[PDB]
Design a protein around this ligand. Structure first.
Ligand SMILES: Nc1nc2c(ncn2[C@@H]2O[C@@H]3COP(=O)(O)O[C@H]3[C@H]2O)c(=O)[nH]1
Ligand SMILES: [Mg+2]
Ligand SMILES: [Zn+2]
Length: 328
């Protein structure tokens, strides 16, 4: 509702406001618009101010991150934007600036943005089983996540992209360690371990305990990474097809190459509805349930849409199953 028309990469006041909430429609925007959103987040969170980030370096860095995301069906730049935009939403929803230092917020946001850089479109189990150059490089230890992190810091070592160039060395070392911990924590193999450790701390949680706070930040980046189904159905739904497209590409390849296949990626065994019912019930709901014990406001904003998505997928499954009753 402005008196003239602006270029798309100039975010409207309504977009800037919408960006603060998990209802934001991530599909609406092209890459250069998404880049403008991410830029706005760094200014709006006070990170440009508190870390003396050169504003032009911020943009060059974002452009370079974008260029180093691959065009996978799921693990692409739009996914990175989702994860970061959910993290941003969490900052406001949970009032994280009351609990976390600016350095922690910087770690959270930058890790979120960087956490899937240069993803090859085939997961760690493929890397390991196929004995790829990556699996060999990283000795079968979270090869993809180690790689994402190493690319992150290769980008940040280019002077014209170094958004940390005005932070003193000790600050840099603190941010580097935090980002490594958080990006490595996104390896889903470690999900049960990290949830257990967190739940231990949750027996008597202490915001001034640095170990407690490291685990909270790992849980937060983990929430955001797998958060799609928290979004409105019409935003969330198209992601599932993207996920399955990547899964099926891998499992087709594994069958062909003579490698082991996960039943959860097998296009013979797997459907949209079956994929999501399990993940929502047994991974997402329980995770957000534990978060909701620190941040009660999470139940209404995030657990509700998950209960809704679960129920809807259970309905879809009934129809899918009937439809297969017709095809023998
Ligand atoms: N079934 C399902 N899995 C998801 C969804 N979102 C993300 N994931 C999984 O969670 C994993 C997070 O780590 P990965 O990036 O390796 O791969 C991701 C997917 O396998 C989802 O909506 N449904
Ligand atoms: Mg990942
Ligand atoms: Zn991811």
């Amino acid at each position: 509702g402005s008196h003239m028309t602006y270029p798309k990469y100039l975010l409207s006041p309504e977009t800037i406001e919408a960006l603060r909430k998990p209802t934001f429609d991530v599909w609406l925007w092209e890459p250069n618009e998404m880049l403008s959103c991410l830029e706005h987040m760094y200014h709006d969170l006070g990170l440009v101010r508190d870390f003396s980030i050169n504003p032009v370096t911020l943009r060059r860095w974002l452009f370079c991150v974008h260029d180093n995301y691959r065009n996978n069906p799921f693990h692409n730049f739009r996914h990175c934007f989702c994860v970061a935009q959910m993290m941003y939403s969490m900052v406001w929803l949970c009032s994280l600036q009351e609990k976390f230092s600016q350095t922690d917020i910087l770690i959270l946001m930058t890790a979120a943005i960087c956490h899937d850089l240069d993803h090859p479109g085939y997961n760690n189990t493929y890397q390991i089983n196929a004995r790829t150059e990556l699996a060999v490089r990283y000795n079968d230890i979270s090869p993809l996540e180690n790689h994402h992190c190493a690319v992150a810091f290769q980008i940040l070592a280019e002077p014209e992209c170094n958004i940390f160039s005005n932070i003193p060395p000790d600050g840099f070392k603190q941010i580097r360690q935090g980002m490594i911990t958080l990006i490595l924590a996104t390896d889903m193999a470690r999900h049960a371990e990290i949830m257990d450790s967190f739940k231990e701390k949750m027996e008597n949680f202490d915001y001034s305990n640095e170990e407690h706070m490291t685990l909270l930040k790992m849980i937060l980046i983990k929430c955001c990474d797998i958060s799609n189904e928290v979004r409105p159905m019409e935003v969330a739904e198209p992601w599932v097809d993207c996920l399955l497209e990547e899964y099926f590409m891998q499992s087709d390849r594994e069958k062909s190459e003579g490698l082991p296949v996960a039943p959860f990626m097998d296009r013979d065994k797997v459907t949209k509805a079956t994929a999501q019912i399990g993940f929502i019930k047994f991974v997402l709901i329980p995770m957000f349930e534990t978060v909701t014990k620190l941040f009660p406001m999470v139940e209404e904003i995030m657990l509700q849409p998950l209960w809704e998505s679960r129920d809807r997928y259970e309905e879809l499954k009934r129809i899918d199953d009937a439809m297969k009753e017709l095809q023998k």
